[PDB]
Amino acid sequence: YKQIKTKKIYEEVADALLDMIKNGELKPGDKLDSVQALAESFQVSRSAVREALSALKAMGLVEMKQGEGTYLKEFE
Ligand code: NA
Ligand code: NA
């Protein structure tokens, strides 16, 4: 029961972001914090955050509005 999955660091970060989506902290259409801000908040490298955001992008959860920021997808 307490045989918890072990994960790579970027996967811990991706899961924390998914959690925030589920709990309504990060809402569809919201601009995500910068890589630097997320790295500091999660106590990980910029590299880990970028890999986590690539994972979310591959899940179709992320987009760009023209440019200058990463946004949670609002409309599928
Ligand atoms: Na592993
Ligand atoms: Na973490």
Residue numbers in the entry: 3 to 78
What text appears in the publication on this structure?
The LutR protein represses the transcription of genes encoding enzymes for the utilization of l-lactate in Bacillus subtilis through binding to a specific DNA region. LutR, initially named YvfI,27 belongs to the GntR family, which is one of the largest families of bacterial transcriptional regulators. It consists of 240 amino-acid residues and forms two distinct domains: a 78 residue long N-terminal DBD and a 162-residue C-terminal EBD. Specifically, it acts as a repressor of the lutABC operon, which codes for three iron–sulfur proteins essential for l-lactate utilization, as well as the lutP gene, encoding l-lactate permease.
We determined an X-ray structure of the free LutR–DBD (residues 2–78) by molecular replacement and refined the structure to the resolution of 1.46 Å (ESI†). The crystal belonged to the P222 space group and contained 30.8% of solvent. The asymmetric unit comprised one protein molecule, all residues of which were modeled into a well-defined electron density map, with the exception of the first six N-terminal residues representing a cloning artifact and the first native residue of the LutR–DBD. The non-protein electron density map was explained by 81 water molecules and two sodium ions. The LutR–DBD structure consists of one of the most abundant DNA-binding motifs, winged helix–turn–helix (wHTH), structurally homologous to transcriptional regulators of the MarR family. The topology of the LutR–DBD starts with an unstructured N-terminus followed by three α-helices: α1 (residues 10–25), α2 (residues 36–43) and α3 (residues 53–61), which are connected by loops. The expected β-strands folded into the wing were not revealed in our DNA-free structure. However, it is highly plausible that they are formed upon DNA binding, and their positions were predicted by the servers, AlphaFold 235 and JPred436 for amino acid regions 63–66 and 69–73. The crystal structure revealed a LutR–DBD monomer. However, the formation of a dimer both in the presence and absence of DNA was confirmed by size exclusion chromatography (SEC) (ESI†).
